[PDB]
Subunit: 273 residues, 4 copies
Amino acid sequence: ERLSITPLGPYIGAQISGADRPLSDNQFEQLYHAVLRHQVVFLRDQAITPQQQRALAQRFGELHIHPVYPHAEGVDEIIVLDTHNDNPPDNDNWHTDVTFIETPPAGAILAAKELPSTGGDTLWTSGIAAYEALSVPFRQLLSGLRAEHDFRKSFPEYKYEHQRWREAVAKNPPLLHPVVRTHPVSGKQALFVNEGFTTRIVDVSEKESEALLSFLFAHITKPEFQVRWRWQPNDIAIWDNRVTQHYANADYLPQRRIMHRATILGDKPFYRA
Amino acid sequence: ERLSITPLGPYIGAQISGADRPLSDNQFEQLYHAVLRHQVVFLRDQAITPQQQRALAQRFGELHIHPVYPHAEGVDEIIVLDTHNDNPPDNDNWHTDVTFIETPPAGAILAAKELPSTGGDTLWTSGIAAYEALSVPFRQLLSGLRAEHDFRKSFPEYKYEHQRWREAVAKNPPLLHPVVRTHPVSGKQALFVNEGFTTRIVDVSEKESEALLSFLFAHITKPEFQVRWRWQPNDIAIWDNRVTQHYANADYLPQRRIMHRATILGDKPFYRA
Amino acid sequence: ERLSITPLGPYIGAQISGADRPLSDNQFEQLYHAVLRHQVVFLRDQAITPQQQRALAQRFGELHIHPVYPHAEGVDEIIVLDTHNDNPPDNDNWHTDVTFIETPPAGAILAAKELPSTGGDTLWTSGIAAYEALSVPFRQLLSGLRAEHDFRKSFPEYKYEHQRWREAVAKNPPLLHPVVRTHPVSGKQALFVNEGFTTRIVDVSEKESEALLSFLFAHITKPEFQVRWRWQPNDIAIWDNRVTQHYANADYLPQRRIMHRATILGDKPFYRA
Amino acid sequence: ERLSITPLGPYIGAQISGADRPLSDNQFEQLYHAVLRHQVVFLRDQAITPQQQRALAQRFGELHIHPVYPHAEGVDEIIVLDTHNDNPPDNDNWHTDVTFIETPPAGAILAAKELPSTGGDTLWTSGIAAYEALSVPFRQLLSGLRAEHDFRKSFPEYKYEHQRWREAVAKNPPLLHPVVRTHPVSGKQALFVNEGFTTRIVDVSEKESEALLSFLFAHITKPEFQVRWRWQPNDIAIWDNRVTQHYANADYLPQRRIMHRATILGDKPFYRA
Ligand SMILES: O=C(O)CCC(=O)C(=O)O
Ligand SMILES: O=C(O)CCC(=O)C(=O)O
Ligand SMILES: O=C(O)CCC(=O)C(=O)O
Ligand SMILES: O=C(O)CCC(=O)C(=O)O
Ligand SMILES: [Fe+2]
Ligand SMILES: [Fe+2]
Ligand SMILES: [Fe+2]
Ligand SMILES: [Fe+2]
């Protein structure tokens, strides 16, 4: 059966009505192409279970186990984000999930488990649109440069365990990813740096890299490049983590908020033409 | 009868269900206090007429006639915003409506007349929240300063008529408004500069004013400080223009978009303690 | 006879000992090549007269008459800069002399007439060195762009006469000059924007032009790119105004300071390879 | 005998003619008050020896031994700065000597041992003047704040030994110094942060501290606030390291440059009124 897809804007974003029980190949194909046409998709009234989410995640590709965040009961592929006073939120910043690994995840699945009165809002900005918005000379200047990503930027040492930390650190040293990434599947061009992990553009002077990142970290903020989602229980968010950045509002404390995430591994980011 | 009010976030924003036919004193009182508790309120399925909107506007205070934007049929108090290729949108920037007059409007009413496929989105950021987010030393530093607002910043000469322009210019010279405004009614403290008109903080060095405005124009961007509304026909937006800024996405061309606005005059902005 | 040339640094700057009575062709040739090898040259103990300076200026090319600054007795080609309380200094900013004309001056001659106790210092920064300091990708990005220069930026309306002003304005509208200029004679590459007149790089988005100019206006500040001169009576400064920017300290008021300038016209700035 | 003192500008800077053989109490008193009236003083033709310099240093206060830089023959109080290709220069940045210790040095003595063709230039900017240049509201805002200084900022780990490094690190953890310091002796007010070590103003939001430091690190750059010295063999530089910042040009490689420094300990920086 056809899926009900309502696009949330001219660029990134959309909402659907399917039936998450496993998906009938034919639907998962519509969904996939959906999570591809719009970088993010939202589904409401889907009270799934950890074991159930991981199943859906696999339908896209192998999963990833976060080296820091805690996992669900007996499902290490499904990250549990339980925030409150004894564990404040640390996703109130523009970042692209796990880019400190050679092959950053090409997608993830968020399940709205337990929510606060209001707030907790999460936004997604499109790298593709952001890129199309760059003047030609800038597209040239950026296409080809490489930027360093450091897991320690969004997971500093002082906030940590300090033995379990050092472990994840040495196992995830800083690496390089193209400033302008080409989509494995769509082949569309998109900006690929995120305030969350990008430390500096390695192919320009320190002051130059500094200047360009200030611009870019801001540039991706433009409201036209994004979508905002007001959480509701048992909501489901699926997005293409290879051409987007997202922010999660930290405005619900002291209340509690519980979210489950399925991290999906992708290939190696690369640029083309 | 009580009104259905659903708050869109911990700070700014909310949605209601009333009956806009004129309001029963008792309701207008709930609405007023609503447009006061949350800086913005949204109502859907309200196919009013220009004459009808202006009526509702008056219920708050005297109106204002914009010296540039065109008016409705036989209602000069209701501004008509018809955008398209022959008249591109010029509200894709953080601004507070008409602050280039000694007594900037304390409110406005937007009617979603004719909409495009998607986009056109409009966001509102809260000056009150933005202010509470400033460290103490900054609150001190800002509370008391004055900033110049110039109608020519958001309505440059080159985009113009050039005789009707010069007229509105000379009749609306640059003036000063406190950087930190106190709410006439709530008495709450709030930042009161907007990238749209604020040219420089007159009480600090040029480089200092420059530095502070960069920070502030950015500071008000923080997602936690705002609400985003996805337009739908016959939607109604009412907001307190004395403690907020708003942005209207320019991502619907070549399509057309029609909006009616009721501008409501307020008193003279002032700071206190 | 050979001239005594002492270079003030690895890049821009140097000091000489000649005899300014007119120059013997052979010397003027050494001087020219001097004012070419180092972008600026300084000569002390040269008590020349206006008529005498203009003579020396001509030896390089036709002169220029500034449309605003006042001229000497009966020599309109020699600008007189008499600063004090009733006429504060307006050259305390990085600028390249007269770039708001299609063919900005390729040189100028400054005569230290009457000096204050100390201060009044003047610095010169090298566009050539500044350019060599740009990473390759930046050199590419910049080489080719065009920037608008507006005489009104460094000579605003409010500081003015307002009839003599409007005259110079209409006769010197904003125009374009390459962001990266190639030297008519040396053929060396150099940055060619100056905080003094450059308003925006016309070939990139407003936010992009804004970002790049912030970087550049700062970049040219790097101490390695400059020379500083501590004025002394009857001192003479000659510099290549087509590959440099200069700043004149405003730290001598209420005292008085008198300087004579010979402005020399150059060809049309252009880029190459 | 009276000393010949020629001030290099209205603020910071000056040149003298004494006789450095030990100083006759009476002269050292003139010199001291000199290195106090102008923040920096320069003496030429003074071919002293390490043992000889340290002697002069002591005349001011106890010395300091740098935990990283190498020392002279048998004089650990006199730092030897020998730069070249196998040891590039690392002082091409605005910094105030050793502020990563609770009681940063109140002075230092530089001896121009062996110089390159040209370049190597060193500049000093005055914190006192820079402070007087801040608008009142800014002086208030800044006076009282505290900023963190981290020895690791100007001596990163990656550039290192890594055992001798960790040693100096643990023995010199980040600490706090007032953003606005009051002079122990003169009692004058002065800005006290330096791009070299200041990491963030601890008493404001991260984005606020970030904004203020950008302004300040730039503010101290203003040419009016400084003095520039063109090195010559056997030159001597003495400056008040508690109200100044200095920069040393890195533009002489591959050539070699040798400098000796006497670091003098001062009291604990504090603010007053
Ligand atoms: O809590 C949220 O809504 C999102 C957290 C986040 O950034 C993530 O799960 O990657
Ligand atoms: O078109 C819109 O939605 C809003 C335009 C706007 O800023 C205004 O009407 O003040
Ligand atoms: O007064 C000075 O030393 C220089 C003024 C200046 O910029 C000029 O004459 O172009
Ligand atoms: O090499 C120089 O002239 C100065 C080096 C420096 O900053 C210092 O010795 O503190
Ligand atoms: Fe995330
Ligand atoms: Fe508006
Ligand atoms: Fe000039
Ligand atoms: Fe130093």
